[PDB]
Subunit: 358 residues, 3 copies
């Protein structure tokens, strides 16, 4: 018998605060859909206020994994700020390593997020809008020291390809969205444009030649792509009054999958209007993308959610309904909640709303 | 335990008549995949002979819904006629309303449906062909009175966009196929071309300015798109000797879905050749599209179908086989029928054929 | 209760040999997702060494089916050889028949398979790479005697279309990937280019006019398309020291599906390095494509695998683990193996690795 066991905990700050602590654990005795096993990964994300006056934060990410004995790592650290409601700017650096190979990089880039329409007729009549169609434009300048022969080979190969292959800006997407990543684009109503290569040259860096590229692309979303529809919400820099962090990891092999998440960050709750608040709307891409793997083994659900509201707050509406309550702490399990967990784990996006207030 | 309960009833006219009464009810205690709940809708479609000499019918549609408290409505009424086997013409009017906002519209449009091949070698050798690849071309002239400020804003915004944005005819499809509608295109082997904007201007209508647009698009189908493969069959104007109608609705929320259908129309049965008739072949798009939502909760099937043949007719072949019979009335439930209901509810298109005769 | 019963047997040659005998049987009491039933098919593939000095083999394929009473057949026989590691050449002939219609054909064609990158940094650090992004270019010259009126009609229709329709090279793909074949492309991360028509003319053949076309297309793969990622491996001509063959067939209708496979060919095992061997990595397209039909009825798994190693060899690693062993013969059933069978039958590609050695 295949059984998914999971526990989730949300502990909320009150007042005007959107912050929450989020913890999760899950295990299921079914294999992942990776054609290489075992596959283990640990991820740590950190972000701190940097310059509140200019709205800059400093964010870092560390990814480490082991896949069929191969050890991988990627880190990236960047300073990011909104310039306007639509244009965001970044500058950063990082590295990637795989077994005995590694390389570094630095970059700067701007992203401009544009909705296809704006209408007060929609805004005033839909209290909790979900879909927002739009397109996001990246402009990136990246640099990689060419300080081993593999880097040199790839740089020269790519220079040669760009020079000789008229369809490079098109076919590069076949390379980029490796394996089933390609398939996931259409699944989420996401489109990636042909790229533009605006600049390609070698620089004389302090330790040697540096490969420098300037390039652009856009990606379109029909409304489910959270990176576009919830662009401002997903970067709550104006709510980051202290450092935030999240650590997560999984272990997986032919026998099953185990996962753990432990984080604290702003944006967990939202002003719902009318003096109510809600847990933020569930982003759609995680459910749709995970939906591509959640349907391969039947499973029973053994799931519990615990939500701790701030002192003095009460739930006004929850659907699925909670099972029990002890002051500010509410618990869901079994019944309609278990059924909703099955639904979203298989790719469904049916709404689970929690509205609360003092 | 998740259980889908459903009942279907088909009552057929005899002789040369293709007409039937179709009733259905279903309920299932699982949530819909809507990221806004509750979601309730009622739909009424009507069509009557208008000018049998020119083949015009007058069709009307009313859609009403409530989604997370927002009240929606759209109506459309049109006169439609075949000009040729491939070209159909229409003229009509309607309105849309959402909360405190509303607008009207009128239009005329032609649609030309073209198959990619015609071959007697296929026709004479395949007795019940299903797939037909082809492409359908729309040419539309629509008008909307710009009689509130939101209409004015959207009209001017769109005029501005068409003027400034070279990729408008491309990216408009991201806006148009909102949310998971985008994803459904590829699922059904359906392609939407870039649009052509042939005309855009303001008219001085009786009550004020009117926004007028003339535009075109084609959509391609690899064979499953019923709008293309069964183009003539889906508009049985030559069989409409009296008014036809269908009413349907659903209620849904975090706890489940309930639905009801009650209609009467031509085209329910078909001449199968050899003096046999069949219930029409199941259209594929409904099953494929619904397949995108039917896989998120395991369910047991409690389904019954009742088919009442005209007096004196008998079933010659049915697969899945029926369970019971009382004169002209045949009933299916359990066993292989329940298994077929599960199959098609999850997106399968395995054939369930009923052939009958006197 | 829906139950899938299946048995698989692999019997391996030893030494440096990659050959194996592969047998399979499966049955399941659920309907196929074919909108025409019954659907029965038998396939026979044969290949023999032809000219070991030039690397030519002679391969033949016979497909026969019956679909809703219509009898179909297609045969193809060809000589195929690698010219280089990337370029393969072929010349051959065949026929197609459907009911009272038939036609023949002959052809020659080259295919060039190109990976998007080559990197020693990947090669030396990933011991068993799976994804390889790339693009494959076909150049085909085919001839069909126009020796009945239907052939003449289609030839003239196509000549007319190519002449009049600017989007022919684009829309031809709607015709080509009939029905759900269209949808399967994106599912497997596969792209088909617009075609190029380089030549179209009529020849005066011995018995009459012959329609001759010269045309090209490429197809891209993001890494799962085995035709691209495992290009050399899939044509083990250098391992074909004697004839190989496989016969397979299925019978299906509204009640269920039964299938049988019986074959012997090189390429069943692979040198894994370190003096180990493995069963070849599971190709991804079969699992992904079948995944599009494997999710419509819940089923229980009654599956057994038997692997017979060459004398004196032992399994070093298997995950899922085997259940029993008798000398060189190992058996899997139930437990984690049954769970893996469910997973891959529904479209999962989680790795099942068997490594063995003396
Ligand atoms: C990922 C989905 C979208 C996308 C959506 C966005 C969004 C949204 C943003 C960017 C931004 C950036 N993108 Mg982009 N971007 C995509 C694909 C790309 C690709 C590529 C080759 O595929 C590249 C090179 C880039 C490059 C870049 C940079 C120019 C820029 C800064 C990145 C950074 O510092 O990351 C650092 C990396 C990480 C922090 C790793 C973790 C990333 C995941 C997604 C974050 C999960 C947050 C978690 C749920 C809660 C975190 C709480 C913690 C306490 C922080 N994008 C795809 C198409 N991109 C930012 C920008 O505008 O800069 C100007 C920005 O806000
Ligand atoms: C930029 C990201 C990718 C990449 C993306 C592409 C794309 C996209 C294309 C090529 C194409 C080519 N690339 Mg490459 N290429 C990369 C790195 C490499 C490396 C290397 C040492 O890693 C090599 C040897 C090559 C070499 C080549 C050839 C195999 C091929 C045709 C080039 C030509 O001029 O003819 N590239 C990097 C890793 N390359 C072109 C081609 O025709 O591929 C079929 C092509 O369109
Ligand atoms: C470059 C990337 C972008 C960015 C892209 C996104 C995207 C895209 C999304 C978010 C979302 C969220 N982000 Mg943000 N985000 C950025 C910076 C920040 C900052 C900040 C001050 O810098 C903060 C505090 C946040 C905070 C938040 C939350 C409001 C929200 C997640 C809520 C939740 O409950 O998660 C619960 C958390 C978990 C269940 C697990 C989180 C742990 C794992 C490790 C996080 C990463 C998972 C992902 C698969 C990894 C992909 C990595 C790439 C391949 C490189 N982001 C940068 C600028 N963020 C999500 C959301 O809901 O938006 C509305 C969302 O979809
Ligand atoms: C919907 C799937 C296909 C499509 C397939 C068809 C087909 C097929 C036809 C049209 C026709 C029309 N289409 Mg078109 N069309 C599509 C997308 C569009 C879009 C758009 C922005 O997406 C627009 C503006 C149009 C516009 C139009 C008009 C020019 C024209 C008349 C519409 C009408 O009166 O509807 C009135 C609206 C309704 C009746 C609502 C109900 C619609 C559903 C689909 C009908 C279900 C029938 C039910 C199962 C049985 C009904 C029995 C009742 C007793 C009647 N189409 C997509 C791509 N279109 C018609 C034509 O050729 O006119 C010249 C026609 O026959
Ligand atoms: C016609 C159907 C859609 C629509 C489809 C599109 C498409 C498609 C595009 C735009 C684009 C734009 N549209 Mg719009 N647009 C609509 C209605 C609006 C409304 C409104 C008051 O409702 C507004 C303010 C706008 C305004 C704008 C800008 C946000 C944007 C760039 C225009 C420019 O000149 O620079 N449109 C209607 C509702 N719009 C363009 C853009 O660059 O978006 C990123 C673009 O390509
Ligand atoms: C503008 C739209 C087009 C059109 C488009 C289609 C399409 C597309 C299809 C049909 C199909 C059918 N149509 Mg027609 N149809 C038109 C006009 C008509 C007229 C007429 C004389 O005007 C008649 C009598 C019919 C009759 C019929 C039947 C032969 C057949 C449904 C059989 C059945 O058992 O349904 C059983 C009915 C039900 C199970 C439920 C019906 C109730 C619901 C409310 C109907 C609409 C559902 C749909 C999801 C709503 C989408 C609305 C849009 C978003 C606006 N149509 C107009 C001209 N029609 C279907 C078929 O099988 O074709 C071969 C089909 O796929
Ligand atoms: C099928 C998936 C890919 C593809 C991948 C490949 C690969 C890979 C190769 C070709 C090759 C060829 N392709 Mg191609 N090809 C595709 C689509 C096409 C289409 C089309 C209209 O769709 C056409 C006309 C062609 C035409 C051709 C010829 C030019 C050439 C020889 C074919 C042959 O003899 O087949 C004979 C037909 C059969 C043997 C039928 C069986 C085919 C199945 C796929 C084989 C299963 C093997 C089985 C698992 C184990 C067999 C063991 C037996 C003992 C042999 N391809 C799609 C896009 N094509 C070959 C080449 O390069 O020639 C120069 C080659 O190696
Ligand atoms: C080559 C493979 C396909 C094929 C692929 C296509 C494609 C692709 C297109 C056509 C198009 C057309 N083809 Mg065709 N066509 C085939 C065989 C035929 C047969 C036949 C006797 O079998 C006929 C009568 C036709 C006739 C036609 C028209 C229906 C149509 C417009 C042609 C024109 O000049 O205007 N083709 C073969 C079987 N045909 C064109 C069109 O506009 O379709 C809408 C088009 O783009
Ligand atoms: C024109 C077609 C190409 C070609 C295309 C492919 C493709 C594509 C693939 C293979 C794969 C394999 N091929 Mg090869 N292959 C060709 C010629 C050969 C020759 C030869 C010396 O000529 C040999 C010995 C082989 C041998 C092999 C094996 C190494 C491997 C299957 C292993 C296994 O366990 O299958 C177990 C076998 C079965 C489970 C059942 C096989 C029985 C059925 C009848 C085979 C065909 C099924 C398929 C759905 C039919 C599609 C037909 C088309 C619509 C026309 N191929 C020709 C040149 N071959 C597969 C692989 O794993 O590659 C890494 C794979 O994906």
């Amino acid at each position: 018998v295949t059984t998914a066991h999971s526990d989730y905990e949300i502990v909320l700050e009150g007042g005007s605060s959107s912050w929450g602590k989020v913890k999760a654990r899950a295990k299921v005795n079914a294999p992942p859909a990776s054609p290489l096993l075992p596959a283990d990964a640990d991820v740590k994300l950190n972000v701190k206020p940097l310059d509140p006056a200019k709205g800059f934060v400093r964010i870092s990410a560390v990814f480490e994994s082991i896949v069929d004995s191969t050890k991988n790592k990627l880190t990236i650290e960047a300073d990011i700020a909104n310039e306007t409601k639509e244009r965001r700017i970044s500058v950063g650096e990082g590295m990637v390593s795989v077994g005995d190979f590694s390389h570094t990089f630095s970059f700067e880039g701007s992203v401009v997020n544009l909705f296809y329409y704006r209408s007060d007729a929609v805004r005033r009549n839909v209290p909790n809008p979900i879909y927002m169609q739009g397109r996001q434009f990246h402009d990136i300048l990246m640099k990689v020291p060419l300080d081993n022969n593999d880097l040199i080979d790839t740089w020269e190969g790519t220079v040669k390809a760009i020079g000789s292959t008229g369809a490079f800006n098109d076919w590069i997407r076949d390379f980029w969205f490796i394996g089933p990543a390609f398939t996931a684009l259409n699944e989420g109503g996401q489109r990636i444009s042909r790229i533009e290569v605006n600049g390609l040259n070698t620089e004389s860096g302090p330790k040697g030649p540096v490969g420098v590229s300037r390039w652009r692309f856009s990606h379109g979303g029909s409304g489910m792509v959270d990176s576009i529809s919830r662009w401002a919400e997903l970067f709550p820099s104006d709510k980051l009054n202290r450092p935030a962090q999240v650590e997560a990891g999984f272990r997986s092999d032919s026998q099953g999958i185990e996962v753990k998440v432990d984080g604290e960050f702003p944006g967990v709750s939202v002003d719902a209007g009318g003096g109510l608040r809600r847990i933020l709307n569930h982003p759609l891409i995680p459910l749709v993308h995970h939906g591509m793997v959640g349907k391969f083994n039947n499973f029973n659900v053994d799931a519990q959610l615990k939500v701790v509201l701030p002192k003095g707050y009460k739930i006004r509406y929850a659907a699925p309904q909670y099972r029990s309550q002890n002051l500010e702490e509410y618990r869901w399990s079994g019944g309609a909640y278990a059924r909703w967990v099955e639904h979203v784990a298989k790719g469904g996006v049916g709404q689970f709303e929690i509205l609360y207030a003092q």
